[PDB]
Amino acid sequence: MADTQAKSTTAPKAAKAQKAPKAVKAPKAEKPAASEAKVSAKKYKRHGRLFAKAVFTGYKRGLRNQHENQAILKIEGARRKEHGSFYVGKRCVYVYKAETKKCVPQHPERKTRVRAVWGKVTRIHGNTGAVRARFNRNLPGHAMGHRIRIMLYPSRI
Amino acid sequence: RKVLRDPRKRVFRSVRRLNPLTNVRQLIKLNPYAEVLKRRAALAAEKRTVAKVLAKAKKQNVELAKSHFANVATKAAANRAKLLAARKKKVA
Amino acid sequence: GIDINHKYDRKVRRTEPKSQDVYLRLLVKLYRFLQRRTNKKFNRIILKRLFMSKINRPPLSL
Amino acid sequence: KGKKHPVNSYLKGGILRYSKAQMYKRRALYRLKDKKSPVVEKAKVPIKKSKASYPTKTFVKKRPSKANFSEHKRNTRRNLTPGTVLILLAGRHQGKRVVLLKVLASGLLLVTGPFALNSCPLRRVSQRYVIGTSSKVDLGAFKVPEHLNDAYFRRLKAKKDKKTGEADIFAAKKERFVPNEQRKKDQKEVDAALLKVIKAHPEGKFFAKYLQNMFALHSSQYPHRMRF
Amino acid sequence: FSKKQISKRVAESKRRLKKAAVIALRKKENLVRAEKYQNEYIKAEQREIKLRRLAKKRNQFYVPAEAKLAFVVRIRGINKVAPKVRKVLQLFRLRQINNGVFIKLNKATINMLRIAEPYITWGYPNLKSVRELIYKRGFVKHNRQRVPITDNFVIERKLRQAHQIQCVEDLVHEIFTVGPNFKYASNFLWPFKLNTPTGGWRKKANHYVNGGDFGNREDQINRLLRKMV
Amino acid sequence: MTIRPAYRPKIVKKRTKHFIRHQSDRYAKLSHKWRKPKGIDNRVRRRFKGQYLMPNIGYGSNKRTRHMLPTGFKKFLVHNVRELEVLLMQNRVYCGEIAHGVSSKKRKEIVERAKQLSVRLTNPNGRLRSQE
Amino acid sequence: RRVKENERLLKEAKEKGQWVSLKRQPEQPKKAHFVKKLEEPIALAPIPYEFIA
RNA sequence: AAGUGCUGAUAGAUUUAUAUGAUUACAGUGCGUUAAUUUUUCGGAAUUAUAUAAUGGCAUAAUUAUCAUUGAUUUUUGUGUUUAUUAUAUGCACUUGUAUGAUUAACAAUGCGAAAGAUUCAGGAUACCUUCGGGACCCGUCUUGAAACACGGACCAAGGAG
RNA sequence: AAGAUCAAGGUUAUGAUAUAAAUGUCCCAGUGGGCCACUUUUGGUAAGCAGAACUGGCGCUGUGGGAUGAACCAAACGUAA
RNA sequence: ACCUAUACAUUACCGCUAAAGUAGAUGAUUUAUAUUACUUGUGAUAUAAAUUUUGAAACUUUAGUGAGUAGGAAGGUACAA
């Protein structure tokens, strides 16, 4: 059965497309002889694609140590540790509202009544698909149950 | 200056260990026998890739020209070259 | 939970003579160059023997 | 005309090379030239050549010793195979899908919409910006970006102003925008061949009339179980 | 001609060749001696396997030679520790939590490990584990100071008088096999200081029988130890 | 402008906030000038969380960033012209910082000399003045 | 008793050429032990009814 | 149990390497020994054909220790046969090749130093304001222990005690 | 019986270690009011009581944990990722 | 499976301790070359280029560790003369 798992595990890699190996079926289903090698999952919620609909609803804390340099981020579509592992790597942005300008020409020219704080996603916080995130600034925590936004850049293949 | 033994240098340069099993170089620099085994089981990986061609080939036709087959073809060329050895070696 | 970096790590013995004497330290500097450069223990202890307090240095009679 | 190895890259310490070099091994024929020559000349007629002591003479400005050149190891791509139709998840062409034409020496991607459909130019984008979707356009028909190289799209020119040389200039040249005729011609030929292959596949989100639409992972849809 | 640079620059090319050549000859000595010990290690696994095979076929139970050589790693304090055990821990050199030394399994040692039990988890270390520890984690005691390794040459460095020992791997042979110079070899290593393994059970201060950790868990340490490095 | 002293690693000011002395915000008699709490009741001395920070050595800056002004130039208290002339060779580690007791007539000479030597002055606008 | 024994072992070993090893080593985890039935296979487990006040 | 093969992510990356100290080592590639077979079928690439040393595996022999002798295992040594594997006999030139023991930079984009003047970018619990989380009980003191429903001290300046 | 002279001795004759250890001066401060817990115990019905034995803390110790807390648990705190 | 102390691992950085060198400059050392000697290849010398004027009662270089009342020592800071 350790051998059978090894044989079964050749098959999805085969399908991917390629390196061109093993077939040893796997279902995507009609199949001529397969309900075999299983119905997904799943585990959802959404957005996804500019921005995972994401929640900054916390900081990574000790019971009473606030430790804000990393944040807990709940990705809506990620129930599971596997799903949140897709988001491991992605760049994040929190876009938020200001009364007062500030920033003039370098890239665009932003009328900076709209401010953006840019961050990257890191490792998988959750038993239930919450993820850690580092941001270049760090998010003020006035952002709590505020919608934060995760673009799918950097995606690996 | 007539009795004068030894001045020389070193500034004593400060620590960080290269761990070999993430480091190519430090595996060989220190010891070897990893190195010896390295070749044999790399060869083993190639051998198992060759049998996977043959298993796919018998069933389906298949082809056979170059992607999987270039390991088969070179493997077969090393056995025809080794066979050339056994008749030629016979007291030199 | 260092079991145990207690004591003593302050040790004992003078690196350099406890003296303002500009002459005395020149001899120390001279024999200190002669120590490792020429091996031999005569350089090693005379360097030390200049460090010596006035007590432990008591006058040798003719 | 040769002799090689080192399959050390798999192993990762090891051989083939040492062992075969021994089988071949000489024990004879060790004779050499390899002429050096300087050109430090006091060639004096009167012609008198030198150079003297320029200066490395202590205007002590402490300037940081140049950290020299890391290796050009060829940027191993992810299985983004040209032509995979892939998403630009980022920067003006945000959520527009485009087809891959090539791998260049800078590491990064050549992307064209095709242009005429989904408004994306001969435009280059990071390997990381991209989710590489399973959908494949036959990339065999193309003129290939053998002709489009790093230099080609490198800008002709951000002068700081009016061509020439120090004319005390004025606010605004064309940092992004004319456009150039050479670049138009390059697009239109490549895009035309794109359109022929792309029309074979039926309408919807992203190949031909399929191309136009602007992406939807619609509310209640999933970036994680989308096996793109 | 003699004391001045005329002879000193000659003592560049005379001795750049000499030093480099003897370093090269000792590299060949390093390779041969290293290959030899790996033949011994692989053979050592086969002897055990074959003894078991031959016995069971003849109906006979050959119960295989009781294990030498333990690795001891510190789970506990120093603070809130009884003084008998505090003293025993200093002598082992185990100064801080998750610092670990190799300790020769003797009738002498095993009694100190017993009073040290809630304070220590110990087991029989596999050769992989000893090799992972010395190359990444293994420092040297040279006049107090805790000094790299990684060089063969710096292990030849002292232990060549304990012949056949000129390599990083040859030190681990000596530890592993409980070779006669084990006292000095074990001493030469300054206690390897090791992160934490992997989900290391809440109950902590219970004998391994009770699901604890702490104990001679025997062969099950190999899983633990490999992860902790 | 003025060319910065000798390639520094970025100056970590590591704790920036003036240590302020315990209860200076309680009392105007207790001066912001730090005085260590020796006293048996101190929650500060036993370093409970949330009782500020006591100057502990580990806030200590790198011995490379020691003294450097962030435009590089370490402070040399320049009494006059001859004093300025010391830092002629040492442009790239030191700045002339005109002592407050120095009159304008001499300051004009100091500033003028400073431009010749090309050594930074931190304060020129010192004592200037729409005045006689 | 040790001096006299050490001198005997030394002499005996030297006349055997090699080797001495006269220093006392405490009881080590011993040996590959073969148990032959003989005199019959084992087995018997144990216990318990241990009530009885 | 095998670096057999391999991917992602995270944080770090002192680099004054001549303050008064190293830059050395290896590897690739080219050079000029040949042949044969094979693959691509162009450029090339691999394996086989030597001597030396070591090692494993076969057979044989001796010792020494051991489980028991049917048969095995050990340490040591020698010998014969064949085969595989590995190292040495592989120098010199060049090299943005690997490391050189804190090896972050190839490559590139952007802001911009735009004379004085001065834009733009980055960065900051100065004072202090704001917004969010978490933490912060009153010091001095005698006392086992002080936030104490223990004692002095409204507040501030200056004299003021080893 | 000592002092002891002379000749003989394969491997120094349990095991880890040594943060180097030993030794002297100051006659140095501070202390001479302890408190608590495992275990062992005496007086007392008992006590957050009076008093020992061994050992650790607290005294001089926060931090994390026991919601809380001088002392129990885990752990001894340069500054940060 | 997950969460998490100033604990634990690594790294930069502070300090303290440790451990080592540093002190031919009418000289030394590196680099390139021309000449000469020997030899394949090295040194000598000439020339050109470059580095080096060290609070050597400190620096360069290194590693291990840091609670702390009473108290002790060490080194500064401020104030008047």
GROMACS .gro file of C-alpha atoms in nm, chain D residues 78-174:
model
   97
  389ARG     CA    1   0.889   2.686  -1.442
  390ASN     CA    2   0.682   2.482  -1.699
  391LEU     CA    3   0.549   2.797  -1.864
  392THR     CA    4   0.589   2.653  -2.210
  393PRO     CA    5   0.553   2.899  -2.505
  394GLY     CA    6   0.254   2.946  -2.617
  395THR     CA    7   0.073   2.911  -2.278
  396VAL     CA    8  -0.204   3.162  -2.244
  397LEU     CA    9  -0.131   3.326  -1.903
  398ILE     CA   10  -0.260   3.600  -1.678
  399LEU     CA   11  -0.097   3.936  -1.616
  400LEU     CA   12  -0.199   3.979  -1.256
  401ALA     CA   13  -0.061   4.319  -1.223
  402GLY     CA   14   0.042   4.649  -1.400
  403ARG     CA   15  -0.204   4.821  -1.644
  404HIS     CA   16  -0.274   4.491  -1.835
  405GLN     CA   17  -0.425   4.380  -1.501
  406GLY     CA   18  -0.631   4.066  -1.548
  407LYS     CA   19  -0.575   4.046  -1.921
  408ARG     CA   20  -0.450   3.707  -2.056
  409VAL     CA   21  -0.176   3.699  -2.312
  410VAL     CA   22   0.021   3.433  -2.509
  411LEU     CA   23   0.386   3.354  -2.446
  412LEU     CA   24   0.624   3.388  -2.738
  413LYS     CA   25   0.965   3.348  -2.575
  414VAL     CA   26   1.233   3.314  -2.312
  415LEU     CA   27   1.500   3.590  -2.323
  416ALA     CA   28   1.848   3.619  -2.160
  417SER     CA   29   1.711   3.875  -1.907
  418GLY     CA   30   1.500   3.586  -1.773
  419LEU     CA   31   1.159   3.752  -1.845
  420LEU     CA   32   0.861   3.672  -2.076
  421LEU     CA   33   0.746   3.796  -2.416
  422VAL     CA   34   0.371   3.841  -2.412
  423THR     CA   35   0.133   3.955  -2.689
  424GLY     CA   36  -0.243   3.942  -2.637
  425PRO     CA   37  -0.276   3.892  -2.945
  426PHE     CA   38  -0.280   4.275  -2.953
  427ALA     CA   39  -0.570   4.320  -3.194
  428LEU     CA   40  -0.815   4.144  -2.957
  429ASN     CA   41  -0.730   4.194  -2.590
  430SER     CA   42  -0.528   4.514  -2.623
  431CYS     CA   43  -0.194   4.386  -2.497
  432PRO     CA   44   0.125   4.491  -2.695
  433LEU     CA   45   0.458   4.321  -2.756
  434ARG     CA   46   0.513   4.352  -2.388
  435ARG     CA   47   0.742   4.180  -2.148
  436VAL     CA   48   0.647   4.079  -1.801
  437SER     CA   49   0.793   3.875  -1.506
  438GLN     CA   50   0.780   3.494  -1.480
  439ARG     CA   51   0.633   3.553  -1.135
  440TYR     CA   52   0.349   3.788  -1.253
  441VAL     CA   53   0.201   3.500  -1.434
  442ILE     CA   54  -0.022   3.207  -1.364
  443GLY     CA   55   0.055   2.963  -1.642
  444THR     CA   56  -0.274   2.823  -1.762
  445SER     CA   57  -0.310   2.478  -1.929
  446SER     CA   58  -0.448   2.636  -2.257
  447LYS     CA   59  -0.189   2.612  -2.544
  448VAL     CA   60  -0.166   2.806  -2.872
  449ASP     CA   61   0.055   2.637  -3.137
  450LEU     CA   62   0.373   2.853  -3.122
  451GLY     CA   63   0.527   2.702  -3.439
  452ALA     CA   64   0.406   2.963  -3.693
  453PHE     CA   65   0.596   3.256  -3.554
  454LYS     CA   66   0.877   3.479  -3.678
  455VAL     CA   67   0.998   3.425  -3.312
  456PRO     CA   68   1.156   3.684  -3.089
  457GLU     CA   69   1.502   3.587  -3.220
  458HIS     CA   70   1.454   3.929  -3.377
  459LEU     CA   71   1.324   4.092  -3.060
  460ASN     CA   72   1.607   4.109  -2.816
  461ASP     CA   73   1.686   4.311  -2.508
  462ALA     CA   74   1.823   4.596  -2.715
  463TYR     CA   75   1.536   4.616  -2.963
  464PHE     CA   76   1.276   4.763  -2.726
  465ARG     CA   77   1.542   4.954  -2.536
  466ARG     CA   78   1.443   5.313  -2.582
  467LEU     CA   79   1.560   5.526  -2.871
  468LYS     CA   80   1.599   5.764  -2.654
  469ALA     CA   81   1.549   5.934  -2.315
  470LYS     CA   82   1.801   6.196  -2.406
  471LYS     CA   83   1.729   6.479  -2.158
  472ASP     CA   84   1.649   6.661  -2.458
  473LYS     CA   85   1.636   6.749  -2.833
  474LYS     CA   86   1.890   6.497  -2.957
  475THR     CA   87   2.221   6.676  -2.981
  476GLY     CA   88   2.416   6.774  -2.670
  477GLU     CA   89   2.376   7.043  -2.412
  478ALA     CA   90   2.092   7.250  -2.534
  479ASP     CA   91   1.943   7.399  -2.208
  480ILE     CA   92   1.618   7.222  -2.260
  481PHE     CA   93   1.245   7.201  -2.176
  482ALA     CA   94   0.967   6.992  -2.019
  483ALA     CA   95   0.864   6.703  -2.213
  484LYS     CA   96   1.012   6.470  -2.446
  485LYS     CA   97   0.835   6.135  -2.482
   0.00000   0.00000   0.00000
